[PDB]
Amino acid sequence: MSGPVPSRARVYTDVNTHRPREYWDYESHVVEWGNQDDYQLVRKLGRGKYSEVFEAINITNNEKVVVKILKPVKKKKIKREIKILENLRGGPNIITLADIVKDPVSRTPALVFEHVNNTDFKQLYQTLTDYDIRFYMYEILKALDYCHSMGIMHRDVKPHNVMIDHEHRKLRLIDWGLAEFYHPGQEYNVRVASRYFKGPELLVDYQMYDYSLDMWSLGCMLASMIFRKEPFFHGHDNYDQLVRIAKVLGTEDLYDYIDKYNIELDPRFNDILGRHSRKRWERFVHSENQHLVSPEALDFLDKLLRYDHQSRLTAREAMEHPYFYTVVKDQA
Ligand SMILES: O=c1oc2c(O)c(O)cc3c(=O)oc4c(O)c(O)cc1c4c23
């Protein structure tokens, strides 16, 4: 009946605003295509959605690389990823776009990324130590703070998008194919991110979201890691996703969130959330995960997983949490 209350990023609100138009205007951006023959496809890695990736080698200098060929997708979408990748290139822990080559495989070309010898995310989880997790979480935070400071929301933060070469302690945040430029007052598509990592704002159709979305997804990751339940919030659909969350954060804070921003609750919700108390994080601590848990980790996770997007810690203040006190601190 009314309408929802507007919202804006609590930090880096207008980093794109006064930057040259070329920076964020990706649909008019045109690319100087690299050469397809410079790379030799060696093996097909994994199995990608609307895109297939391969292990490969640059013929001109035998450097190992990963070629990502794009499938039947709209131009402006390819441009968006390319433009975002080029802009963030050089930033801490951001995957480096080594090249973009033209190839008539389906009206779509290919993206060349630096090679990351990452351990199968599924087996790696099970071998990390308390320090490894604090270290890696810190590295991801560096990537988010930098990208957010460069005006980009990743929108698909999850274990599958964090390549980790554990032997080299090298970490890269990948798949910027859903990333978007933040503009205050803008209403974005709530599709983005994987179900299990979607912030409440996406689940209740709140379109004026921001960088803080990535912080919720990061929280879901953290939770799955320290508690060893991957994923932590496992819902069946958007509606069930929020229910899984409420069974932990409670329903009261959820109801307070929707009222604060005057959110139109869909018929499918009024009776599905029910009534749940706020559960304590210590409840999920058992003999299989206690070594990756600590009071600061719990306090940290608690400041990340908040219904209200504006209340969640920003990447930078997350890096200032005691949870990361032990982590290196050499700043270089
Ligand atoms: O930069 C990437 O490196 C990768 C890999 O090294 C890999 O082994 C598998 C993948 C993969 O499955 O999907 C990807 C994406 O959708 C994407 O946008 C970027 C990358 C990968 C990727």
Q: Which CATH superfamily is domain 7-24+116-331 in?
A: Transferase(Phosphotransferase) domain 1 (1.10.510.10)
Separation CA 314–CA 316 (nearest Å): 5
Are 5 and 309 in contact by the 8 Å Cβ rule? The answer is: no
Rounded distance from Cα 120 to ligand 1 centre (Å) = 12
- C-alpha 110 chain-centroid distance: 22
DSSP assigned state of 142: H
Rounded distance from Cα 212 to ligand 1 centre (Å) = 24
Ligand 1 touching residue 68 (CB < 6 A): yes
**Helix intervals (H) in the chain:** 21-24, 75-88, 121-125, 130-149, 200-203, 212-227, 238-249, 252-260, 295-304, 315-318
Rounded distance from Cα 104 to ligand 1 centre (Å) = 20
Separation CA 100–CA 79 (nearest Å): 11
CA-CA-CA-CA torsion sign (246, 252, 253, 257) = positive
Helix axes 238-249, 252-260, angle to 10 degrees: 120
Amino acid at 130: D
Ligand 1 touching residue 174 (CB < 6 A): yes
Ligand 1 touching residue 113 (CB < 6 A): yes
Among candidates 278, 320, 276, 281, which has minimal Cα distance to 299?
Answer: 281
Which residue's CA lies nearest to atom 15 of ligand 1? 175
Enumerate residues 6+ apart whose C-beta is below 8 A from 303: 312, 313, 318, 321
Ligand 1 touching residue 51 (CB < 6 A): yes
Going through the chain in order, the beta strands assigned E by DSSP cover 39-45, 51-58, 64-70, 97-101, 110-114, 152-153, 162-165, 170-173, 180-181
The binding site for ATP consists of 45-53, 68
Which residue's CA lies nearest to atom 17 of ligand 1? 175
Are 317 and 323 in contact by the 8 Å Cβ rule? The answer is: no
Separation CA 55–CA 67 (nearest Å): 6
Helix axes 130-149, 212-227, angle to 10 degrees: 170
Ligand 1 touching residue 163 (CB < 6 A): yes
Are 170 and 140 in contact by the 8 Å Cβ rule? The answer is: no
The torsion angles phi and psi of 146, rounded to 5 degrees, stand at -70, -50
The torsion angles phi and psi of 173, rounded to 5 degrees, stand at -90, 120
Domain spanning 25-115, CATH architecture: 2-Layer Sandwich (3.30)
Ligand 1 touching residue 97 (CB < 6 A): no
Q: How many CB atoms lie within 10 A of CB 302?
A: 14
Ligand 1 touching residue 52 (CB < 6 A): no
Are 54 and 36 in contact by the 8 Å Cβ rule? The answer is: no
Tell how strand 110-114 and strand 64-70 pair up: antiparallel
Rounded distance from Cα 3 to ligand 1 centre (Å) = 40
Domain boundaries, the chain: 7-24+116-331, 25-115
Ligand 1 atom closest to the CA of 48, numbered from 1? 12
Separation CA 324–CA 9 (nearest Å): 24
CA-CA-CA-CA torsion sign (258, 219, 119, 124) = negative
Rounded distance from Cα 126 to ligand 1 centre (Å) = 21
Rounded distance from Cα 144 to ligand 1 centre (Å) = 18
Which residue's CA lies nearest to atom 16 of ligand 1? 175
For a substitution probing ligand 1, which of 89, 175, 176 has the most ligand atoms within 8 Å of its CB? 175
Ligand 1 atom closest to the CA of 115, numbered from 1? 6
Separation CA 294–CA 148 (nearest Å): 28
Which residue's CA lies nearest to atom 8 of ligand 1? 45
Q: Mark whether 156 is an active-site residue.
A: yes
Separation CA 170–CA 172 (nearest Å): 7
